[PDB]
Design a protein around this ligand. Structure first.
Ligand SMILES: CCNc1ccc(C#N)cn1
Ligand SMILES: CCNc1ccc(C#N)cn1
Lengths: 304, 304
């Protein structure tokens, strides 16, 4: 019993973190096979970040201008290329700790673990979700860029995020490992406001299922609803609209608790219209939306 | 910016997890140098757990009765001893991934990371605190016993917890790595009620400091208080009494924000007497107490 915000074990990713230094700027890189991936803004001065032309700045950068350190050993850079907003440094040594891996671009509402790193050294691991406005709410200080987000299926790491920047509102933006930003963000020291940070309804419902399984049952109500009726309430409270695809995904949790998805919706409707009233669910006074239905099943079944 | 419930990177501990099987019971063990540590209840049938005599049950157990598997390789057990509530299986192979380590017995209110494991395989990592009633609120399914709690200082793992059991209220009890339970709990299938789960006041204050640093400032009030006045309110709200030792520990956070510890107390006093009023602090609608002053400094300074 018990239900925790749980990250994936980090060791497989720890074995891939390196330090990348281009002149004055140090951040983190991800070393898989014989390529190191890092944010392309490692080539910039603070002055360059105002309106950078990355292809222009890169003309002045040679293989020997990219210092890569793995632990306290130097790697030899034998090629480099830009791909969207990331650099790919080819090194002459395959990472001998390279796990099975994939690069995946996640959808908003999907969760992942972040291995926060500084100078190529792991500091901590936490669980994030891709918000509906394509920001994440992380914990990143100066030097954390190039820290990565990932999911693990048994022994395969699916890397889904690389950290690039902090908006003036202190939320976070980054790229997939092809270097494409999530959302509309750009790697420049310019005005970038995030859109509405709506609540990930399907994840809230998953977590309510997680709750009931753990006996935290007080919020269960005598009502049902319909998708359309629920969505009128969702829209009012800045929740994502629930679709039948979300209902289908919650099916296994419905099947476990014998609480029909629309019943759990009608109960969420009451939590939204009446608040917790100083009560808590799984140790939270707000409705938690950074567990996916898959996360709830995984944690409640003890997948390794 | 941003402030997350962060676990230590888990790889150093991942490299120490093994599966221990004694007849029908499988759980996890911790392999350091040439000893595997596990809960002594691995020797018991479900029937044995009603009123077990561990020294009596152990007479019937020889070295070859303890199956230890590290990945998919068997370890040869060349000795075993009981120490309090843990078994120590001597194996003929030093764990080649043994990190620098210590065994520490933590105090209530101290936080640690848990590497939840099943069949010797890591499933997830999360941050816990030793509660004032010597329980932890974990996420542990059947098979998770022998999962460990730890802190890391640079490259030294301080192991502080091994998971043994779940109370009927679904909170968790375990031992240090000398096999001594935290709190009054015993490894038996018997009535064990936890005491008052009071709030760890010094940790709440640390987290309020973490908040102000991140600009989440609305709760800052025009008041100060005294330790004695604050403690009258603490006692009412089932908070731990604040001592000068706690004030001393919060000194560095006081020094950063220019908010005197007693000012932050007077502000906590108002959050306690008036609630959040539907407002949030660092994404929480309750006052978070599983960050220590050390955690806040560590996370806010990016220690690796
Ligand atoms: C002056 C530093 N400002 C920065 C740094 C990195 C990024 C990105 N991506 C944007 N602005
Ligand atoms: C029937 C299983 N019940 C158990 C198992 C482990 C412990 C401990 N420690 C207590 N009860």
């Amino acid at each position: 019993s018990g239900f925790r915000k749980m990250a994936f074990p980090s060791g497989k990713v720890e074995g891939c973190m390196v330090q990348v230094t281009c002149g004055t700027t140090t951040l983190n890189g991800l070393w898989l096979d014989d390529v190191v991936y890092c944010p392309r803004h490692v080539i910039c001065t603070s002055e360059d970040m105002l309106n950078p032309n990355y292809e222009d700045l890169l003309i002045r950068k040679s293989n020997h201008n990219f210092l890569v350190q793995a632990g306290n050993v130097q790697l030899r850079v034998i090629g480099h290329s830009m791909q969207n907003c990331v650099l790919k440094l080819k090194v002459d040594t395959a990472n001998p700790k390279t796990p099975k891996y994939k690069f995946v671009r996640i959808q908003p509402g999907q969760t992942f673990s972040v291995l926060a790193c500084y100078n190529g050294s792991p500091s901590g691991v936490y669980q994030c979700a891709m918000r509906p406005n394509f920001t994440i709410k992380g914990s990143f200080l100066n030097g954390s860029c190039g820290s990565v987000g990932f999911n693990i299926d048994y022994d395969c790491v699916s890397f889904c995020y690389m950290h690039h920047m902090e908006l003036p509102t202190g939320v976070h933006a980054g790229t997939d490992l092809e270097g494409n930003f999530y959302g509309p963000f750009v790697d420049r020291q310019t005005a970038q406001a995030a859109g509405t940070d709506t609540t990930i309804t399907v994840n809230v419902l998953a977590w309510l299922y997680a709750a009931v399984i753990n006996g935290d049952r007080w919020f269960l109500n005598r009502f049902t609803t319909t998708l359309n009726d629920f969505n009128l309430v969702a829209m009012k409270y800045n929740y994502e609209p629930l679709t039948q695809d979300h209902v289908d995904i919650l099916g296994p949790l419905s099947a476990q608790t014998g609480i029909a998805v629309l019943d759990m919706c009608a109960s969420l409707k009451e939590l939204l219209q009446n608040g917790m009233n100083g009560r808590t669910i799984l140790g939270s006074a707000l409705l938690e939306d950074e567990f996916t239905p898959f996360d709830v099943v995984r944690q409640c079944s003890g997948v390794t």
